Each structure stands twice: as C-alpha cells, then as structure tokens.
Amino acid sequence: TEVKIKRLYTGDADFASQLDRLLAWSDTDIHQRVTEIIGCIRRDGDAALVELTARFDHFVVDTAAALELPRDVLEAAWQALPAEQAKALREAAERIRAYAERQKLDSWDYREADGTLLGQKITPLDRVGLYVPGGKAAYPSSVLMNAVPAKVAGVPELIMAVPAPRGELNALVLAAAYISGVDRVFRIGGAQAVAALAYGTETVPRVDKIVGPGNIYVATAKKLVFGQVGIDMVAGPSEILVISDGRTDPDWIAMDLFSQAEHDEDAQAILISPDAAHLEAVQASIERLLPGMERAEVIRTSLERRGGMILVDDLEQAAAVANRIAPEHLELSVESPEVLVESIRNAGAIFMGVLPTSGTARFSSPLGVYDFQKRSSLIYCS
Amino acid sequence: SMTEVKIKRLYTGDADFASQLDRLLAWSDTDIHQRVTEIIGCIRRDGDAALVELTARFDHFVVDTAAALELPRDVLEAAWQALPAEQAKALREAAERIRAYAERQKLDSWDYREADGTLLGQKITPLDRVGLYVPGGKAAYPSSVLMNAVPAKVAGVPELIMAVPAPRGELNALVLAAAYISGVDRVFRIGGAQAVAALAYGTETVPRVDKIVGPGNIYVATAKKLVFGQVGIDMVAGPSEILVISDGRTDPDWIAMDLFSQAEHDEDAQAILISPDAAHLEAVQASIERLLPGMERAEVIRTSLERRGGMILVDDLEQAAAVANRIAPEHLELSVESPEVLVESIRNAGAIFMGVLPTSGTARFSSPLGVYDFQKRSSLIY
C-alpha cells in the first residue's frame, strides 16, 4: 500500500545535487533505420510510402491515392459522436481558437526620419503537417491544440498524418480533425510519414513544418528533417509542479499529482510546500486514493521513479525552487496566487486557484499560433 | 574568354526545371563531433580548471585563474572612448535603428475574461540569462554584437554574457565598444566548444545561461547543436543569399552591383537573378563581366557566382514570385516598377527590399532573430 516518494529538504547540504538528480532525464540501430526510410521516401516517393505503410501499419492499398481519407469521412465521424463528446470538442476548439486569435501576430510598418519605410510582414506557413498516432491511444486534445492555432494563423493547407493499423480508425481523432479545419488526412505514420511530409511525394504535399508527438521513429525522423522543415520541440514526459500553502484538501493535491502522473510512467509530479504536516497528509491521501485509480500502476510507477515532495522554508523559496525546476505545468494551490505569480519566471502554463517540458520552459514558449506564422523584414527606401 | 563568368542558367520551361532549381539551391567532421563531445565533458567535469587549460591550448591565451578570463567593464568603456568619432557615430546609429525596431516587435503580457468568467492570459518574461558568442580577432563584426545584444536588452534580459576568444590576447576594439553601448553585462575571453559548454552548464566563474546565440566556427556550431535542450540556440547560418527580381527597367550595372553586394563577402554566398526579360539577363551578364575586374574582391565574387550563382528566366512577374517563393531567400530585392504590387505575391523571404536573417530556405518557416527570441510566453489560467 505504501508509495515511496522521494522527499527533499531545502535545508539539506546536498539539496541542489539531489534536485538535479531528481530532475535528470535521458538506438544507433533506430537512427540507421530512420535514415534508410527517409532515403527510401526521397528516392522512390509513393511506391516506397505504400510499401512501408503495408509493412509497419498493416494497411494495404493499391495506389498511394487510396491512403487518403475522403473529407466526407471526417464530417461523418464528427456527425456520429455522442452529443456530449461533440459538445466538449466544440467548446474546447472554441476556447483554443479565441486564445490563438488573441496571440496572432500582425503586419505593420513605420517611417524613419529620412522617409525610409520599415516594416514587419507576417505570413502563415504555406503548409503544415500534423502527426497523430494511430489507434485508440491518441487523444483528440492533441489534434485540437496543434490544428486550431495553425488554422487561426491562416495556414492554407493543413495536412494530417495518422496511421490506420489494419485499417482501424479513431472516430474522435477524425472528428477533431474535422472541426479544427484539417484540410487533408492521410493514413500514414512513422518515419515514412515524416519523410513524405518533409520532402513530398507525388501524392503527399511537401509541408514547411511538422508538429505532433509520435514514437521513437517519428521523433528521430523529425530531428533528421529539421532544416528541410521546422519542427515542434521534442516532448519529454509530462510534468506538474504543485506549490501548496497547506490549505488545500490533500485529497485534491493528490488528484492534481495523479492528473499528470497517470499518462506516462516517466511523468514527473512534484509537490512543494512549506508545511511538513501537509506533505504527510498528501502522502496519506495518495496511498489511500491510489488503489481506486484505473491508471493506478502507471501513477505508482511515475511517483516512485520521478515523483518528489520538497519541504521549503516558505513560499518565496517555493518560487525559487520552481524557477529552478522550470516545470511544464505549474499549479499555485495557495490563497493569494495573483501575488505569488509575480515571483514566477519559468513555467509553461500556470494554473491559479504542446507545453515545454524537461526544463525547456527556461527558454521556450508553448506551441501557439505564432509558431505557424513568420515575419519578414520590409525595407522601402522610398 | 578571359573575362567570361560561367553563371548557371535556368529556364522555367525546362522539363527538369524543378530538379535543376533544387540542385542550384543545394548546399551541404565526425572527429570534430568526438572532440567537441570530449570538450563538453571536460568542462562539465572539471569546470574552471578545464576552461583555463583549454583556453591556453586553443587560444594561446594564458591566465593564472579563471577570474582573469573576464574583461573589466572599464575596458569596454575605454574601447568605446578611444574610437574615431565617425566609427563611434556609425555604431551608435546602427544600435539605435536596431533598438527602435526591437521595441516595436516586443511581446507584451495580457489577459481576458471568458464568458463564464474564467481568466485566460499570457505572461511574457525575458530569458533569465543569455550567452552571446562572437568570434575572436579582427575577423569579427560589431554588427554581430549589436544585432544580438540590442534586442536581448530591449527584451529585458537581466544578464547578457558575451564570450569572445582572445587569440594571443588580441582584442577587437569595435567589438568591445559595441558590447559597451549595447549593454552587455559581462565579457569573457573564451571561445570554441569550451565556451559553449561553459555557458550552457555554467562553471564557478561563468554563469549558466538559458540561450546561446551568435555564429562561429564548426566547433561552436557543433557544440551548440549538442547542448540544445540544456539551452536554447539560434538558427544555424548559413552562407549569405540574395535573390533579385528585375522587370528590366533598372540599369543592368545596378543589378550587377546588387548581386555583387552579397556575393563579395563569402565565396559560398548565393546570388540569384530572376527576370522575365531574356535580353535583360544577357545585359546583366555583360555588366557583370565588364564591372567584375574593377572590384576589390573580384576573386571571391567570381568564385561565388561560379559555384552558386544563377540567373532564371521566367514567363512573367507572377512566375518570378512563384520561383522566389520556392527559393525562399535570406534577402529578396524587388527591382521592379511596382514593388508594392509585386510584394503581395511574395510569401517566403527573410528580408524584402523595395526601391540576423533565415538562410538556406529556412525562410519558409523561420523569422529573423529579434527581440521575441529573447522573450518567452507562459500561459495563465485562473
């Protein structure tokens, strides 16, 4: 029943190094394989894509044109969702759209003293490729959070790759692609899909940026085609950092940790508090509520491998430690978070009352509309 | 003839045109990768000791302690104060133009209320610390300092740290003066892979930064690639490129000089001319062959034109813009009668001239380096 979670104390002398080891996170054959696949796609295009799709996905088609899903299929997958899921999808997409609309970059210009016109010309990327994994194990959220900002940016051709293992489709994924304005959907995946998107085939249009997480083949391929296309940041496992003043119900804090611990065994969930009693209470809440979780084994694995509870002297030190951690997700479960947030510098998303992980929030932003736009300097000497 | 310059010629009517263009644009060590890995390891393992030693071995710059690697601020001020009045004037002016452009590009925090009352927002922060690499000796340009440092300081970066190696102690006055007026906070006489490692991981003497920018040799580029993840980096350069579109009204000598402007500073530079006027292309060839001998860097210009230069005949200006959009040049010049009309068809270009930039076709998906690259966004949810 016990869950052994690493406990750290800011008073300890070896604390910095312990925090380092807690945050630490880290094949030749895979690199070789992906290189070969990319080469095959560049050299032989569609024939290679069809063959590799039959090999990896067990999806057999006569011509590459058949890899594509008709648009009617997308609309129909949407039309057949249970009413509540449809509601949820529309609402989420709308929130994402509104937010993207507010972040959208605009063109402008101005005149220097001599009369020179200087300006910034904003354009959408010409085409964007979105990768989504096949089967039941994909989440519609990833589709919305990549595709919606891309369409708000004004990207004219948004192309999705999602493999169809043995022909199998994910209704929610297709419906999400439909309502987010995905333009074309191809049943391809893996390194072969990345290569097809990056270089083009006679069937697959060449895109300028590829986003969306996938397996080791997809990640490796994305790294190898960077330069030919832009890519999104490589995702590490999810992270949450909770700063708690001790006033919140420990059952709730526990659920806050489970929220991110539950979807990756290598996820990192950390709790910081100046209250030791509160930390013990949350330990208890974890051990009690854990069995009743459906993802109990994964949650346990994550908490035991990379979980942590850090006792700090106060909320100031909590903010300092957080700024060192630079977490993907930061939750300020404290009484005056609008005050505490003033001390926060490095965090992907902050919850008071796609995202950069593995400490890259020290220098990166979440994926947003701006990543599907670009600027050109304009100089008109008259 | 002895004066002739073999410049690659393409025509959009060619059946092989797409591939010919691909081959024209194309431009592409293991022992270096090993060495750099070892240097990074030594720096992580031995810190200041390793940095002092490696600086002694590689730069022949010998100091007793790592503290002695740093240049006092007094030195920067004195480098500025000893400049000829006109150089100082030019430096200040350039720095000011850059500053004014950066202020206009600066990202701002904001928030708004959803209908239900949920608060959504964007919190903008500057990067905590930024490292700027500048090559050593006389072969460095103050511009490289200004174009990184000024936008970083506009962004509000609290600690801007510069590495510039001092081979045999040698310094570049213009570089130091540029560091002075652009608000560089600290300057260290270190370079190569060891400087990148020192900045990325920190030593007792060198502060750990969150992003490293500034182009350098193969050791610096390799090191930057290897530390990406620990820090942000800038896009890798990237020999210069210029693409000129000419309708034929412009004096062909002027076009020739336009091509020369970028061809003359790198033998690997790419200068391409596009026109729907075949006679004009011939005229520019003649102007090139006539004007070339009188150029001071005639040898470099010729080498560049011969290796990567090109002239492309198109059907009309529509197609000129289409080809330009495929090329996606660093620099684009619209030498036509109505550039304010033609620019509407232009999508992919680092900078556009009518009347640090992305190169190698990355203008299809990248923006120039600017203030926004030294800022980051955090999502707020209340």
Per domain, the residue ranges of chain A are: 1-25+235-353, 26-234+354-382
Alpha-carbon distance A83 to A147, whole Å? 22
Q: Are B259 and B237 in contact (CB under 8 A)?
A: no
B238 prior amide bond cis, ω within 30: yes
Pairwise CB contact (< 8 Å): A350 & B123: yes
Pairwise CB contact (< 8 Å): A375 & B370: yes
Q: Are A347 and B338 in contact (CB under 8 A)?
A: no
Alpha-carbon distance A364 to A354, whole Å? 11
Feature table: binding site of B for NAD(+): 133, 194, 217
- The amino acid at residue B282 is E
Query: Can you give the length of chain B in residues?
Result: 382
Most B-contacting residue of A365, A367, A379 (CB-CB within 10 A), to test interface: A365
Contacts of B310 (CB under 8 A, 6+ apart): B7, B8, B9, B10, B24, B270, B271, B272, B273
Q: Are A375 and B367 in contact (CB under 8 A)?
A: yes
- Which residue in the set A120, A230, A376 is minimally distant from B350, CB to CB? A376
Alpha-carbon distance B29 to B82, whole Å? 41
Q: What is the spatial order of strands in the sheet that A209-211 belongs to?
A: A184-186, A157-161, A127-131, A209-211, A230-231
Chain A partners within 8 Å of B125 (Cβ):
345-346
Contacts of A196 (CB under 8 A, 6+ apart): A41, A49, A161, A186, A188, A204
Q: Please state which CATH number belongs to domain B3-27+237-355.
A: 3.40.50.1980
DSSP run (H or E) holding A378: strand A373-380
Beta bridge partners of B275: B313
Alpha-carbon distance A70 to A85, whole Å? 23
Q: What is the topology classification, in CATH, of domain A1-25+235-353?
A: Rossmann fold (3.40.50)
A58, A144, B382 from B116: Cα distances, Å: 46, 21, 12
Most A-contacting residue of B128, B241, B327, B365 (CB-CB within 10 A), to test interface: B365
Alpha-carbon distance B146 to A312, whole Å? 42
Pairwise CB contact (< 8 Å): A377 & B357: yes
Pairwise CB contact (< 8 Å): A351 & B381: yes
Please, where are the H alpha helices in chain A?
A: 15-23, 28-44, 46-57, 71-79, 83-103, 140-153, 171-180, 190-199, 216-225, 250-261, 276-289, 296-306, 315-325, 337-340
Alpha-carbon distance A364 to A346, whole Å? 9
Chain B's closest residue to A98, CA to CA, is B114
Cα torsion angle, A178, A183, A188, A190, sign: negative
Neighbours of A184 (CB within 10 A): 18
Q: Are A159 and A196 in contact (CB under 8 A)?
A: no
Feature table: binding site of B for Zn(2+): 262, 265
- Domains A1-25+235-353 and A26-234+354-382 are alike in CATH topology: yes
Cα torsion angle, A116, A122, A127, A129, sign: positive
Chain B's closest residue to A372, CA to CA, is B365
Q: Are A267 and A241 in contact (CB under 8 A)?
A: no
Pairwise CB contact (< 8 Å): A103 & B122: yes
DSSP state letter for B207? P
Most B-contacting residue of A363, A365, A382 (CB-CB within 10 A), to test interface: A363
**CATH class (in words) of the domain with range A26-234+354-382:** alpha beta
Beta bridge partners of A373: A124
Pairwise CB contact (< 8 Å): A349 & B381: yes
Query: Can you give the length of chain A in residues?
Result: 382
| Both structure tokens of B298 | 């005639």
Q: What is the topology classification, in CATH, of domain B28-236+356-382?
A: Rossmann fold (3.40.50)
Pairwise CB contact (< 8 Å): B128 & A99: no
Alpha-carbon distance B257 to B242, whole Å? 12
Closest by CA to B130, choosing from B379, B381, B373, B322, is: B373
DSSP state letter for B310? E
**Is A31 labelled as part of a ligand binding site?**
no
Chain A partners within 8 Å of B156 (Cβ):
none
Alpha-carbon distance A6 to B228, whole Å? 29
Chain A partners within 8 Å of B201 (Cβ):
none
| Both structure tokens of B309 | 């230069």
Resolution stated for this PDB structure, in Å: 2.1
Alpha-carbon distance B198 to A323, whole Å? 21
Contacts of A203 (CB under 8 A, 6+ apart): A46, A49, A64, A65, A67, A68, A186
Q: How far is CA A134 from the centre of its chain?
A: 16
Chain B partners within 8 Å of A366 (Cβ):
377-379
- Which residue in the set B110, B348, B353 is minimally distant from A379, CB to CB? B353
Pairwise CB contact (< 8 Å): A126 & B229: no
| Both structure tokens of A206 | 């060449």
Pairing state of beta strands A117-124 and A108-111? antiparallel
- 3-class DSSP state for residue A272? strand
Chain B partners within 8 Å of A341 (Cβ):
123, 380
Feature table: binding site of B: 133, 194, 217, 240, 262, 265, 331
**Is A263 labelled as part of a ligand binding site?**
yes
- 3-class DSSP state for residue B101? helix
DSSP run (H or E) holding A268: strand A268-273
DSSP run (H or E) holding B58: helix B48-59
DSSP state letter for B309? -
Alpha-carbon distance B113 to B152, whole Å? 31
Alpha-carbon distance B38 to B267, whole Å? 32
DSSP run (H or E) holding B70: strand B70-71
Neighbours of B270 (CB within 10 A): 26
Experimental technique, in short, is X-ray
